[PDB]
Design a protein around this nucleic acid. Structure first.
Ligand SMILES: Nc1ncnc2c1ncn2[C@@H]1O[C@H](CSCC[C@H](N)C(=O)O)[C@@H](O)[C@H]1O
Ligand SMILES: Nc1ncnc2c1ncn2[C@@H]1O[C@H](CSCC[C@H](N)C(=O)O)[C@@H](O)[C@H]1O
Ligand SMILES: [Mg+2]
Ligand SMILES: [Mg+2]
Ligand SMILES: [Mg+2]
Ligand SMILES: [Mg+2]
Ligand SMILES: [Mg+2]
Ligand SMILES: [Mg+2]
Lengths: 455, 239, 448, 239
RNA sequence: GCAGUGGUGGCCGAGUGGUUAAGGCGUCGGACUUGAAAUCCGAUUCGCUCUGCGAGCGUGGGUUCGAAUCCCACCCACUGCGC
RNA sequence: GCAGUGGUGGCCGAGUGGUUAAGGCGUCGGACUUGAAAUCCGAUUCGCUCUGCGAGCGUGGGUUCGAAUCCCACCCACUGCGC
């Protein structure tokens, strides 16, 4: 979420800037106006509640002193209460109680309302984002690598069967729509991809981390969105009831790894190479070339995750470094791609900017997104309460770390890209960087052993 | 870049509050008595010499020179009430030799407590750096009216490129040579030209104005560092 | 499930052997008598139902030919169609009653049959106390040496375990595995997959949840409530997370007629397994030893049901596992599990229990089981490709054996290869480890 | 090992049913006419020669030799009704030269259809191998009473180590040299000593008893294999 | 997730309210032929008290004397949409 | 899952119905000393209209004028059981 003081104008805030940003993201403004009025009321209510609490505390202290000195029997002051019998101070305490209760109800309502208005407001935008709402027209292509116009015979939907590495019908009998068995040479290729990606990220300084696949609901709420948490996440139920949700990405448990912590600024750029199986419930088929193992319910993904300093433009340098790491990965794999800057209307709520690596599929004749690199700034760290220093200052407010994430390799989609880009007439040529991790006999070619299902 | 322009206004309007809370949290234990005063200035050396101490703090600058030379009457000025109360509660205090009073050297006027053209020497020891660079000539003019027409004003404060200036992080910078500490008090680092053209614009005459160089060394941490203070003496024109 | 002809004296079977086997497994032997009576009544009911259906079809054929219960073909040929319709109503009432009786008998007949375990192999130790009668069959290595730390301290000393934050994120027993231990687990998976691939196994990555209609045929009722997580989608599906990759691999060939020529089917399952029971029995069972989620590599074989080939393959599977653990340098003994602690499908089970020198105990690392045709006939995986006229089909034999559960094998490696400066890397995993981790996993934290 | 002892009893009690269903599924198309008969045996060569054909099948052994030599009366014996009906529906059939009848050569008796000591030659061509080894002497005695005291019995059937004995899988073995086919009919593979001591135990006299070697070759599959039939002639003692 | 067409035996493929589920293809065994075979004869879903009868055409139901054929639901495909 | 003891601040650790949540330890900044420092002075949970007042001792509640102290529930540990 954003800092609430960005909306308080009595503090150094300015809700007009939040309105401009909420317009550029093509979201609903006026949420800024509702927030400003709710916040301005909450500040006065907080002042009044503090004063009522002070009066109640002073009444209790005076009562304790009267009792321990063995006494014989709301513009109040310290000396003013010092001249009342205990019964009268309790009579006053009852009025204090009524006022405190109604003020507390009003304050809780105002807090909840202001927060549910602050919840929608997206992060501030980096000035490099292309302002638009048409993703198909305004996606800003930044860079291009390789030959992105060559065509080849088969698409991945045929190639996964011609190598005998895919079982779709039996998978759908076992698991249902989209279930699949990966078998034979494609299990070795997936494992080779995992080894290569983990070794690359580990040499760059990332810490490989194998995450749990069940997240609790209390923690998943703080790392996910309303829509995702509603219709995109599977729910797990054990004996009892069951508040667990299968993770949709490893970025969700890794974000909750330093939850509620005061991180030392030294060692602040913590880099994590997450490794897990992801479970997504939305699988829609836009044609034939999106079937096969391209959009599935279950797949392994290697993720980059970085906690960064919020100062000195460090998280944006880190953003460039992460997209560069993924670019060099796919260049060593020899896969052509272009980098696109996503338009304002397509970013989710946490992102200030998002880059995508879209690989060219020569057998399908299309661009398909393989990597997604986001810089969510302190939008999530504030929710998770991951503070930037170990010590809180006297007067200043607490500062939070920035959190970036970027897919390094989703195994099924990268397998599809490798199959389409390395097909020959006799089989799939193995990429030179994966021959270390392949068994003997599978280090030069993955032969075709079945005919094409289309033919 | 620099500190928020809103925050610099809050620093200026809360200068006295920031100095008062400094004396609240630090008491009289932060600064140490200055015994180098008498030696440094050719004045103050060994009749009835009436003196004004602008920005007297909790003492630490007049009590040494006042227990040293016993024929000096002293006026003490400070805009923080806590500092005045500490000066009064000092056991070395006696009304026959001191006249302490609160006076914001930029807003208030000195004639409300001292007689005009009476003081023969006024000291500015690390006091002008706590004043905003655009309200310093206010202080110079406020003290110009109480100085005897042949008297002088003594000044030591931070100079350019001192180590303390060095140390400050970039998030503590208000402007060119203008910083703020963690406690809210500020520090301006003067240059000879700036101070000269600030005293000349209010009717003074320069006598000596030159830097003084020292060093700070902590043997245990083996730290030795350069320090650059600017010492000077300005004199009110006779006629 | 056993062949229902084993309980019918009419066919070449007899329930006395089944009762004596239910006694050897120390289970209930009264199920056999109920099964035999239900089966003998069902055969009569089925005969009567076939005769009623025959009469109905002759009535229909007579009516059809004329438009264009001691009844005979010629007997019906002499009736007015209205008379044939009256006869059809009588036949319909009789068929309704007979079908009610037959469904009841089949229901009870199958209920009593799915609780009779497989026949036993004459090598099985007949007893019920596992701790004394499990025949330690062979020893390998030095199973008496003792070393300083247990795995519960070693996983922290190398900084590869996060239990507290994992329990915050996932709950009791949740864990993050990080750093050097992720590389070691991946090296184990690589080495196991190459070992099994050289032997003729086909690696197979399975789905992690399974439809309930399919999971029933591979698991027991005890497992679903006690051990299977339930996955809920949208609109409230009924899928379950798999407890082992043997469950999806078994369903890979359901309702098939396999060619006897390609009968020695071997698969190396790779998947993540999810268990609910993580009950602890002291400190040495904490850490990553009993968790809810772990990767496992499985052996699954479909075999011919003839010529004792299933038991030869059983020996071959346990030998493959043994060689895997001898090449890693883990000392173990092979144990013949007692008949009391066998699951329903297993007709014999061998566990490989490794010596833990820091814990001072034997821990099970491999479980090898031969379920014969218990699950093949429930899944209808048939041996021949053609059926003979008047001859029942034969089902294949199915065997499964753990090759490597990665968390437990990591625990065994850490406890057996600890030094004063760290953990020595086993000689066979060095090629699958990153540079810098090919001789020693260094200690970087103190022992808790 | 061998076939279940329960199953061997079911095979013995269902011998006639198994042969009947063979003629139902295969009709008269499985076996081919034997034209080698007249040449092989010195009898049957070119007055009124009355003959008994035990196990006549659907013909295939008497119709050739019966259309060849036109002064032969023939008795036909078979325990399968379907085979008898096929023999009768044969267009080459006439009652003046043939007398077909069903008779289980082990249970039934031949005197109920043929006169004693009347037949001058009886043929056993691949018929005794379908009879259980412990009920063969029953057949030999049943036909011993209808043979003229100087007549003989002609016999060709499988011998030891023939290829057909080899092909059979181990799950098709009932005992030493005793197998069962997929259709339920059985095959016993005789040895010279076994047949000799089986005919001698019922009152016969051996004349010739020696193996006949052939093979079988399928050029397209390039299969050439050895075959070992046992041919013999036994004679009823004159006096 | 809608709003259309579909689903036949190991596989292909006919099927028309009264099949023997045709024809192929594949697989499996039996072969006794002297006119042997560069092949012939068969079998090849489940059940029963088996030379026969019963059940089965995605799975369940309905209408009909009778359904593989007509109807409905569900499941799974393919073609268009929503996402 | 029972049937007992427990849960204090970044950490250790006092705490006794009227604290200033003691003492340490760690971390962080400020230093103007001529008698500079082989150190000194401080800060270090949240909130508010900030020299102060309010909230906070696993989390929620109760009793009391007043609870970190007493009671209850839940959660999580440890010790014994069931499994
Ligand atoms: N504008 C102003 N008017 C009056 N006093 C001021 C002032 N600005 C700062 N001060 C005071 O100047 C003092 C500087 S601390 C220095 C005190 C003195 N020079 C000494 O040697 O000890 C502060 O206590 C502050 O209260
Ligand atoms: N015990 C027995 N009594 C009578 N006939 C028998 C018999 N055992 C087998 N058979 C018959 O013998 C026949 C063998 S098939 C051979 C038929 C004949 N020898 C020919 O050359 O064509 C079968 O048809 C069977 O019906
Ligand atoms: Mg078909
Ligand atoms: Mg056909
Ligand atoms: Mg149907
Ligand atoms: Mg603590
Ligand atoms: Mg303290
Ligand atoms: Mg509490």
């Amino acid at each position: 979420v954003l800092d609430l003081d960005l909306f308080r104008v009595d503090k150094g805030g300015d809700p007009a800037l939040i309105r401009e940003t909420q317009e550029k993201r093509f979201k609903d403004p006026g949420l800024v106006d509702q927030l400003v009025k709710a916040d301005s009321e909450w500040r006065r209510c907080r002042f009044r509640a503090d004063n009522l609490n002070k009066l109640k505390n002073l009444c209790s202290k005076t009562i304790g002193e009267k009792m321990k000195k063995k006494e014989p029997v709301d513009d109040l002051t310290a000396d003013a209460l010092a001249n009342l019998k205990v019964s009268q101070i309790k009579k006053v305490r009852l009025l204090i109680d009524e006022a405190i209760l109604k003020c507390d109800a009003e304050r809780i309502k105002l807090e909840a309302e202001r927060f549910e208005n602050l919840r929608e407001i997206g992060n501030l935008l980096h000035p490099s984002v292309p302002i638009s709402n048409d993703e198909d027209v305004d996606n800003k292509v930044e860079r291009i690598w390789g030959d992105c116009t060559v065509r080849k015979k088969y698409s991945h939907v045929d190639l996964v069967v011609m190598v005998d590495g895919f079982e779709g019908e039996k998978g759908a009998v076992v698991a249902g729509s989209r279930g699949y068995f990966l078998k034979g040479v494609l299990v070795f290729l997936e494992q080779a991809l995992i080894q290569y990606a983990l070794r690359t990220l580990g040499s760059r300084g990332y810490i490989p981390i194998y995450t749990p696949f069940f997240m609790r609901k209390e923690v998943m709420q703080e790392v996910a969105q309303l829509s995702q948490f509603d219709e995109e996440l599977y729910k797990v139920i054990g004996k009892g009831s069951d508040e667990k949700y299968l993770i949709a990405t490893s970025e969700q448990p890794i974000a909750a790894l330093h939850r509620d912590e005061w991180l030392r600024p030294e060692d602040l750029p913590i880099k994590y190479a997450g490794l897990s199986t992801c479970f997504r419930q939305e699988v829609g088929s836009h044609g034939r070339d999106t079937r096969g193992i391209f959009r599935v319910h279950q797949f392994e993904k290697i993720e980059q995750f970085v906690y960064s300093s919020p100062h000195d433009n460090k998280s944006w340098e880190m953003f460039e470094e992460m997209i560069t790491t993924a670019e060099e990965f796919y260049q060593s794999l020899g896969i052509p791609y272009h980098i696109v800057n996503i338009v304002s209307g397509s970013l989710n709520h946490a992102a200030s900017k998002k880059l995508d690596l879209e690989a060219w599929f020569p057998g399908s004749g299309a661009f398909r997104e393989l990597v997604s690199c986001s810089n969510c700034t302190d939008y999530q760290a504030r929710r998770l309460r991951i503070r930037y220093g170990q010590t809180k200052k006297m007067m200043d407010k607490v500062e939070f770390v920035h959190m970036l994430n970027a897919t390094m390799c989703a195994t099924t989609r990268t397998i599809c890209a490798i199959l389409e880009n390395y097909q020959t007439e006799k089989g799939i040529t193995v990429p030179e960087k994966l021959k270390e991790f392949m068994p003997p006999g599978l280090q030069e070619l993955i032969p075709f052993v079945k005919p094409a299902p289309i033919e | 870049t620099l500190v928020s322009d809103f925050k610099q206004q809050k620093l200026e309007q809360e200068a006295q509050k920031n100095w008062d809370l400094f004396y609240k949290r630090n008491s009289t234990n932060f600064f140490k008595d200055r015994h180098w005063t008498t030696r440094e200035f050719e004045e103050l050396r060994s009749q009835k010499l009436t003196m004004l101490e602008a920005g007297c703090g909790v003492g630490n600058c007049l009590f040494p020179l006042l227990e040293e030379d016993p024929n000096i009457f002293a006026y003490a000025c400070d805009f923080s009430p806590r500092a005045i109360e500490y000066v009064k509660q000092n056991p070395l205090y006696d009304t026959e030799r001191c006249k302490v009073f609160q006076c914001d050297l930029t807003k208030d006027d000195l004639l409300d407590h001292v007689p005009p053209e009476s003081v023969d020497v006024v000291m500015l020891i690390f006091v002008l750096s706590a004043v905003h660079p655009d309200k310093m000539h206010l202080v110079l003019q406020n003290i110009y009216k109480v100085l005897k027409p042949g008297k002088s004003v003594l000044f030591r404060d931070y100079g350019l490129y001192d180590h303390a200036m060095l140390r400050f992080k970039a998030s503590s910078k208000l402007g060119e040579n203008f910083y703020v500490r963690q406690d809210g008090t500020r520090s301006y680092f003067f240059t000879d030209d700036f101070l000269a053209q600030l005293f000349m614009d209010t009717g003074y005459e320069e006598v000596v104005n030159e830097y003084v160089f020292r060093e700070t060394v902590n043997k245990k941490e083996g730290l030795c560092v350069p320090r650059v203070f600017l010492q000077s003496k300005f004199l009110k024109p006779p006629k």
